[PDB]
Symmetry: D4
Subunit: 185 residues, 8 copies
């Protein structure tokens, strides 16, 4: 089952974390982790600050790097370098309503591509992505070349966006404390 | 083939059985069991009463529990706890006309989800479901929390309904002796 | 797991059954069925008499034939013609102490052969056999030719015996009521 | 590849063969055999007359039976009883223009069903069918019960028709010498 | 690879933990967890006390039960009921020197059995075991019957011991604070 | 992943190479090789001239033949005869803009066929093809018969075209130095 | 099963056949073909003379070549070039007593090698070999280089001999009419 | 086949190459590359000097790093970070007589371990190793910790040595020009 083949990954922030703010009593990042854990057996967090907090919830923490690369791609590569699965489902810390069929729908719609990411009907969410580790070398080469754009990389790897326009407000992102108040229950 | 990979399960009733009433000379529950047995090699019955009757037809009977949980979910979990397959096709005792392509269509339309159930064009039949045992832990947690709603659970697991609107009257349910008379041949 | 890939088969007798006699309160044939059911999910009985008794224990009964062939091979072929698995573990009704690792050891020692049977250190037990359905055509041809010898057939199919000389008295066969008394507890 | 997993079967006639008549210098049945052999490695002929002729082309001949059942289903069952593959692609002797993508399209459109057959846009061709051997037991039971209708059986097994309406005149059947003249090149 | 197919499990104690005592600066239970984590991606702890301590190391904690069963078997069953893998490698908290090839050797020596445990040359260690979840139903039945003996259960499931007599002092168990002093570096 | 299962093949020319001309500083053939290498681990070049140039880029060169057959099919067959994979993705040297999802889309759209090629919305590109080695024998027979037409062969093998009409100008072919100037950046 | 994965091949002679002489009423080559057909579904003959005779038994005939190479290796390569399986079991026409477990024992003893051949206790029989088609390219290169020695090639490919010293007189070869008389029954 | 699943790797030297010296007219490193290429489809070279020379033979060159780690382990990790296979067979540049069954024997003797290396009867050759990429994270952690010992790492990963004591002088290493003269033909 996908549950035992894809490693879930909370992208908590590369070199505070707004993901620590509570939504309905639970920190934003833990909404994401809990949603991934309902669908996937093995779930880790990519974090470079507050490691003890993430770890304290029973999750393994993967710290970045080797080289101090910038942005989300750097965390993705760090996780592939430090974890053995074939497949990873990444999600940032601030999208607490991700749907219960995230992994299944992304996988079903992959069309044999090594990477896919969510399009919510309005925009792309390239860091909510199902990634095969076969693109580890390409990612390393991309970052070594000084490149940083997420979607450009994912397209260059042969990926595409998957339509989640029917999953209402599942991909809302909590940008600030103020937005968080529009969502408190 | 699906025939040898999915265990069929007649949900005969958790803690008489109207499924014992005869439709065209054959008990309602045996219509269901026979339909499952045409499509699947290994088929069992979840029953907590009249166990000897079900067993007498050559079917293994799984009794509920561990804990006295309520409703169909309790029987589903009981069956996963007591049977070793990866996949189960559950069906209640009172839907005698289930189609010969039930398992194939549910599986084909799963879209990589760990659970799917029938929608007949008019309504959901959440207890006519193809279930991967990976959701055993989630089900246990759900029931331990005091929750009982079937479709809510199946959605939370990442499942969805599968359209059988073209399978005419295949999902009629015999609620009472009176309805049973509308169907006698 | 082997549990969900091999169909167990009690060879109860082709055209009373001494296998109906009780050993320590349980009929000989049910000792065998219970031993197979501990190791295998799906288990059936090949019987041509007392079908209701076997069936009443929750086991599907396969009756012989098509053609009225003689002996155990006839039952084996009948079962392959009427059951869909790839693999079958046959055992006669009168060997109640068959070991809990029967299927695993036979499979482990197959050496890529399509059939293997037990040798107990003293003699062959060719009807205690793990059989791939690929030899269905060969068996049919053998029986159509008027041949009946079990071990000859199994050798001709490319099979061999597997040493169970360390499984003490596991393959005792209860030939008569008198032998049964040497074993009563 | 499908080429090495599906056994092709020319249904040449159960208990002359009009399939022996030549179309553009090649016997109708050999048009079918050649089309199957382009797509599939292992191809056999079900024949009960002129066995030497079919065999002489390098094809193994499977004769019917065990029991003298009627019609095409009888040949299908005979072939499953005498051949070891999981999958069979049957075709009658008189449809010489069957397409080069017959096996691929039938398989692609199976929708997890154990049997599928061709619909040419105007009618069903239930004997041009892709069949999983899991339905061997059901077929045996059907024929033993005295039933003979092909499509009824295939529906009861959970099968469906596959649209080949775009494959122009690929499913023309040569009923008589006269029709054969409408096709001579 | 085995790394991504077998779930590691530290058996930390069912209803203080001596496994909390430090050996060379690291708690005994964490020696075990670290050894399992070198070989396996996903590793959990079965604990019913000090849950926060185990969880704080980044490990998911599985608490016992459903029913208050006794002993290690109860923890094994609890873990299978609450975790989705096919395979589990259990180890108690007080065997800190378990070898780096534990999972590979147990798996290699399984001989198609659904469970295997370590024999160190002097004695059995039945709670250092590689277990297929197919024996979940058997375990449940065993415990419901009031049975508790570990090795008896594992033999009844078809398992056997695997020789680790060449892995010197790898299976030393720290019974008390005094034994722990014989090992301090 | 497809990356490690399909061998990429640059069809550089059977018995100068215009593919040696530079587009934006990189030879046309190396545009193709680089595009294939982003998607596939193992990539080779079919060349019969300038072998040292192709080889110098780190690519293995496969020279034609056995028999001096004509055209692209000859190179395809040469490559299947000299390389061990199951699957090959061929592309000529003069289509430098082939898309990053070439292999994934061709594979996803194969519909169980052993060969597929690109249609760009305006025309077929039968030498941009995903080919299963099962058609090696058919290809050999075709060429031995004196036949040379690419698309005819691919249709006869059971293949079809795959729509890439949405991949803008990805299949432009540089026919001459003059066309190459319309594309210089 | 091996029956449906390995193609049997009678090596009948490259550019009369003593294999046509009758042993106990059946031609030597047909003893071999029949032995292969008991173990394997799909069996072909490599022949360059008397093609009609071999074909007349229902076997497909593969004629040599492309290039007029010498010896048994030439026939092996011809067969791999013209047949789609992954695995081939070759045997010459004059070893009529080959054992019923030939394919299983060769496969079991392969030790992950791409080719294995029989050693009968006294000598090697390098043309009684189980061959993976991955060595097709190596074979082509070997023959193109002007090399002909069978065992040298098989060793260079990474193969080894498999001990059949316990299969008494199974590998007797009938060199002449005179030897054939020592064997007539 | 192993040929298409394991990537061969010549370890040519991390930050002249004595591997450039000719043995019987062929550079030592090319003896190794050629031996790997006979057994494996895809073979690369890890080199940090003379990259153009290695590349010129048709081999892809992987340069070290990310971080400037020391020794052979650094090259192994570099290759896993930059190549997508599951399995790698590493060999240094100066062991020109490596046997034709290197990959098969190492794989056959792995005993489910993620890494194995050659023991020649006299000593270990830990850089002649079959490595699963699952140990990429462990290797990274090991090197980041400042550790460099090869065999220690391979043991810590759960590996073991494989006996090649019967492969005479296959593992001779050419240390110097003088040793090279003891071997010139
Ligand atoms: Zn059953
Ligand atoms: Zn985990
Ligand atoms: Zn065949
Ligand atoms: Zn390569």
């Amino acid at each position: 089952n996908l549950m035992t083949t894809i490693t879930g990954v909370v992208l908590a922030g590369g070199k505070v974390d707004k993901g620590l703010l509570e939504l309905n009593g639970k920190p934003l990042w833990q909404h994401v982790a809990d949603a991934l854990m309902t669908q996937l057996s093995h779930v880790v967090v990519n974090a470079n600050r507050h490691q003890e907090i993430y770890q304290a919830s029973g999750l393994k923490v993967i710290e970045d790097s080797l080289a101090d690369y910038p942005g989300p791609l750097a965390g993705m590569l760090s996780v592939m370098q430090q974890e053995a699965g074939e497949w990873f489902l990444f999600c940032p810390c601030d999208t607490p309503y991700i749907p219960p069929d995230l992994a299944a729908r992304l996988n079903h719609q992959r069309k044999d591509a090594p990477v896919v990411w969510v399009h919510d009907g309005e925009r792309d969410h390239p860091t909510i992505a199902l990634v095969n580790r076969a693109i580890e070398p390409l990612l390393l080469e991309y970052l070594q070349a000084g490149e940083r754009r997420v979607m450009v990389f994912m397209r260059l790897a042969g990926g595409h966006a998957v339509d989640f326009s029917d999953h209402k407000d599942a991909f809302v992102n909590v940008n600030t404390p103020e937005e968080l108040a529009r969502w408190q229950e």
